[PDB]
Amino acid sequence: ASKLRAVLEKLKLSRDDISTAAGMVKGVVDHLLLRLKCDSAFRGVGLLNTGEHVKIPNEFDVMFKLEVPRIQLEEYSNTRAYYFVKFNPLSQFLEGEILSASKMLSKFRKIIKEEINDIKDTDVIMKPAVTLLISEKISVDITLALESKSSWPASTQEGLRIQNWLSAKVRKQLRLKPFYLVPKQEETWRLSFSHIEKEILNNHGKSKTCCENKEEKCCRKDCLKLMKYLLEQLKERFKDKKHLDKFSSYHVKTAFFHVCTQNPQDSQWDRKDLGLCFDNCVTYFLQCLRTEKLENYFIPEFNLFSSNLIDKRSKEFLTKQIEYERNNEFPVFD
Ligand SMILES: [Zn+2]
């Protein structure tokens, strides 16, 4: 309780520094926004949202969207999340009727690499996305996404189980918004709902006025922040072995969404209960590791904790560490 509020207070001390690390990212991103818009295949390129951190802070995430009419999806080998694209200026990227991720992605690179070599002032360099490093500290991941305005694919029909939490009316309204395809067969694309993830986090209560007044302060955002921070701290400490580096804040974010579904009432996230809500988040994540199952929140048959993605040994390792931390009141938080 008191230890975790001290952690949150420390994290806030870093906020008047993102304000200068994110401001520098953004100006490099609008500079590419223009050059892409000058290429004939990336003319309807824009930004998705305003406008994410995997490290919470030197990793920054920006997604470039791109409207593509006449979309058509073919599910790669009933993997639920991976698709080929079929149907214009994008005809240069197709290999036999289907849209080639690797071709479209590889010209994305050339155009950006052509540009970071022309910003002579700031020392930006290049190193599922393209990673830039602005002036030796803060990097950014730039992801290209295709936008489709059609109904969501069949593998999402049982996902986004927010009915008992955010209501069926909101689930209806969210599923009319577009969805996105990100390049990972190497010509396959992966569903992305980053835009929905952000909206659910910022409009996160059963009560429409959750966190808009002093009588309704939940600790939902503070639990996700602690969870992401727990993982970051553990990865730093276990860097002599580096067998935690398959895990990412997106696993924590997904697990936190499942816990929101389990604890749908704002009274289960009362700020006074920070210690117990955080514990709820950690034990669920723990169960995900021990069962080797972490369902993508939108695609239930897509297991992020598969053996394909993360081997058994790494999950066993993180289990033993999180288990020890939870049974000892998180000494990793000092
Ligand atoms: Zn709230």
Residue numbers in the entry: 162 to 212, 216 to 220, 223 to 253, 260 to 299, 306 to 362, 371 to 520
Article passage:
Cyclic GMP-AMP (cGAMP) synthase (cGAS) is essential for the host defense against cytosolic double-stranded (ds)DNA arising from various maladies (e.g., pathogen invasion, ionizing irradiation, and genotoxic chemicals). Upon directly binding to and dimerizing on dsDNA, cGAS cyclizes ATP and GTP into 2′−5′/3′−5′-linked cGAMP, a unique metazoan second messenger for initiating type-I interferon (IFN-I)-mediated inflammatory responses. cGAS is central to antitumor immunity, host defense against an array of pathogens, and regulating autoimmunity. Here, we resolve these numerous fundamental mechanistic questions in innate immunology and present a unifying catalytic mechanism of cGAS. Finally, we reveal how mouse cGAS achieves more stringent substrate selectivity and higher catalytic efficiency than the human enzyme. Together, we set forth a unifying catalytic mechanism of cGAS in which dsDNA-binding pre-organizes the active site into a rigid yet adaptable lock for two sets of keys (substrates and intermediate) necessary to specifically synthesize 2′−5/3′−5′-cGAMP.
To further examine these discrepancies, we crystallized and solved the structure of the catalytic domain of human cGAS (hcGAScat). We noted that, unlike the mouse enzyme, the three β-sheets do not move upon dsDNA binding, while the catalytic residues assume different rotamer conformations. However, the activation loop in our structure was mostly disordered (thus not modeled in Fig. 1D and Supplementary Fig. 1A). Comparing the B-factors of hcGAScat structures with or without bound dsDNA revealed that, while the C-lobe remains steady (likely via dimerization/crystal contact), dsDNA drastically stabilizes the N-lobe containing the activation loop and the catalytic residues. Together, our observations suggest that, instead of being fixed into a specific autoinhibited conformation, the active site of resting cGAS assumes an array of inactive states and its activation entails a dsDNA-dependent disorder-to-order transition. D An overlay of dsDNA-free and dsDNA-bound WT-hcGAScat structures.
